[PDB]
């Protein structure tokens, strides 16, 4: 009789990369790079705040347009490119740091405080910042002006006797004329100094016309102070002070901000990009280097195929290290669809085929053990650094860019090497399981059969279907057939 | 006779991770993550300076409390959380950069210089800074005041004609009243400008009361200049100048600073953390991301087990690639305690067991070669970046945090992959050595024995203890027994 | 007859590192670290601009010495250590950021603009900046002075109505005396404020003598503004303004700057270091961490040898996992120079040797597949961060240094692990190909030969040269000789 060992093959193989070859065909493979988004930022499970027409800073200051954002919290604040300011013209020195610390804090929770502004006119107001069809101002800021043509020197204190840090936002007004300076504050100069036990911020206003923003040549420069428990805010002003009305609560947590024009969708996804939410089943992604949540790692490769099956073809230069698959076994069997390894036989009762379940399962379990290491195990990242920039800044920006490029190149290397190593090992382990099955079958047959060199055994006795079945299921008694087999082997 | 090949096993195995399995038991394993400190910073072999009640900046300025730190050097300066300043109230713009450059320099070596302060009163003194029960000041700073109610415009020069850089520390006094400004300096304003060939630092004092620190509403702002050889320091002051008394030597080397409340111990250890000194035998550590010296690399894993022995069990899905261990050899032998591989026999004279030394050693040497790559080869790091922060700063701090998080995640990946790869290879190499021993034994026996399929050979002749011994030690002559063996094999 | 399987060896082996051994000899190996430069910066294929005696900033401002650099472009600007400024003394706040953004832009393209300087004297000039033997000034800057002893308040505007960004360079003059201030500008103070819609830069000059640079105690402080399309530059000055004569075009691209004293050579090389251009065939380099172009990655190792051949020696502790090379095959054959694996025979007609081409090629193809992954696949880097520093700066510099050290250590790890893994696999794959050839030969011979245990087969029949040739080329019919062979094997 004849008993042949073999493995399965498929008509639709997949090309993968290995350590020793750029292009080898395997029976099956899975993609490890996520390359697509559905185009929507899912509203679950992270608390999304669409900024819509407002930036985070405008919502913080209290632009009238952003009145509905009062005391809001978020996991992720989404800034739109269409956003525009429509209150008094302002600048923030170190705007990026203020935007970052508020975004990381994740709250616009504001508590009003009763400051003693004796001797000055409160609630100053402008036609550049109209609220409910009336001239107004930033909701969190108090513009102070002269009362009875006098602005006395202010020396106003507020202690932090709480158990949490207080974030104070205040500003300095720069009029476009000496005339407006006199009209507003009486005083010719003006000067603002705010202090804590640990800090001093001293600002001297600059009178002068700047290019008009929405017809306004004057500006407000915005500053912030953090006052910890047991510390005290102290505000000296001889004019030009845009006063705080209280403090923001500042928290620490997982909160962040992202620039994106993707719509908010009614859906659930853990990983957010500016292109929209992405699946996180895969370990790597090519969609965006800017991410929030439990996200695949950004890599530069567009595709990385992990082999999830054996080799599909013979090829000498990538043949497994044991030399069975693509080796002494000439080809796989497309007609074996119930297992990865198996037996074909020819006897007196005909020709048959049967899969080996134990070797098939042993190969599958090893491949699944690789998949369990790589699939569905992404790591959470929240507030990070900015990675896209609208203006030239030089040295700090060069550093932020370099850090991200360095990180991406290292992760792109890790991903490439991982796939090449795993694929080489997957091809070698599947070759190994075939070789083990052949060796086990050979030992079983003892002196009753000879290797024909092609994965087939010439069995030197009469072996019916039950006899072939006994070999396949490990119950073959060689002693039963040994005399018949030895006579047939050793003759003339 | 019967001769069986086998391997050792133990009752107390250890679970490790591989490429293809999350949980596999091996005979032995070693821990690669250091997770503990003894709680003391060892005083050897690095030169430790305990700052005790003083910060590095207070010791630099010459707070009276820190007079014993004059001209000290260190490899590592240790700042305590209990530390407090008890001289005149001061701030430093870019305090972190000054603290860093002094810490990296590693010396408080100070050389006095004779500045020409003609026309002003020297050695100004305060009740806020008492030394030996007398009102005093910072030991390295010279407070200048009016003489005869006049403060002439100063224009004082000092050349660097040395061969080393000079670090000058100076300050600006901000009085809390215009009255104190007049009393001290005569002049209503005051102004300080210090220059080199390459730099200018122009400071305008700010008169005004700040929140009181130890009853003092006024402040001194501290600045520094570095003057290189062939350059010149030039100091213009029309008042408010806190003058230097000389320069600090500035060096480059391995020096650093660390925040820690761990006691200094009388001991010797190369790696220092804020939690105390740690062993550096292991390649990785989980104790602290802040380190100094020849230290294991910080990783996020709490444990990483490297297999140092073979597989302890049979398991089909992780059976070695050669298929002997956990394969056709059903189980290991707990009663073999003199070697990792060996022989068991049954003959006419009884049953015995003996270890194979050459295969045992070949496996051990390979595992030791892995250990030699990983154990006791840590790399020295000294002055780095700060990694814990007491205040919100925004953009720069976001970057410093991101750089460290990026580095830790990459090293944590390297450590995880290394263990999984090495463990897979260790299991495969130990399976290989077993297979090689079996194959070598098979070839030795020629036609005188048959494989029974379980790692045992049925020897078809009479083989006494000396005959079994000859097989084990490679002196078996097959030709001697061939006729006897062939007759027994090939019969009816 | 006797047929022996074997492999080649060489007299001049090369030591490599593996996973399990520090020192193993292989037949051949290639170097993966580039350690040398030819000492010249090649002028091709990147556009080189030698700055010679000029810095990039001096060429930008228009030092007379740098007049030949007007409107130049470059891929790489080369600054020399011999470079020196010979116009009016200047400083740049954030000099490093300005130098960086211009270097990255890669162009000195300048367009003159007609500013309305009504009421002031234009084209101010100095003996500190002589051009063609006449007193002059920076070519891109316009020094404004009083006209008729009056300096009216300037309020000068320039819109960007183009489609590209404009880079404006301007300055502030600080006279060394109040007298020179009056002589030049009439006004006692002077003040400069330049604004856009988005920015304000307000500079107050500081009257005062600094240490003389080439006999000059006064200074010009340089500032820059970028004005985007639809934005407007606005310049207010009441004195001391060093005016722009137009704008620089600003671009984005692959341009950079490098400090180097290496000569420019007439040659072609893609990778530039400060030490000179380097070959980029190798994946790693030890020459410099500062690079430009398609460059090998900087690593700390001086040498890394990748094995490109099999093991050259027997050694038990690193013997391949199949146990043929350095195993049951006692040694290689130095006399086999036509292939890596082969046959030696002894028969009735003599003794011979012949190489196996198919196994030799299979090993070579796998090794070449590794080489194709590592050789000639370097990645392009252009403008990065600075990595060498001439002055102490503290925190930002600590961060830039830490980022680079972190990156180098990670790449140095990747390179070390790659070589150790590849070399282990190369030794194992070459052992595998030897084992496959032996196993294939064994199956071919069937019952006509016996393994002697040393890679040699005892063939139990008369096998002439044509019979040996038939075995080597896969046409051996075992059935022809089986009766003769069985009689000789199984006798007394």
Numbering used by the authors:
A (entry chain C), B (entry chain B), C (entry chain A): 25 to 516
What do the authors say?
Hemagglutinin (HA), the most abundant glycoprotein on the surface of influenza viruses, serves as the primary antigenic target for neutralizing antibodies. HA is a trimeric glycoprotein with each monomer composed of a globular head containing a vestigial esterase subdomain in its lower portion, and a stem domain17. Each subunit consists of a membrane-distal polypeptide (HA1) and a membrane-proximal polypeptide (HA2). The HA1 subunit is comprised of a globular domain (residues 116–261) formed by an eight-stranded antiparallel β-sheet motif that includes a distal shallow pocket corresponding to the receptor-binding site, surrounded by the five immunodominant epitopes (A-E).
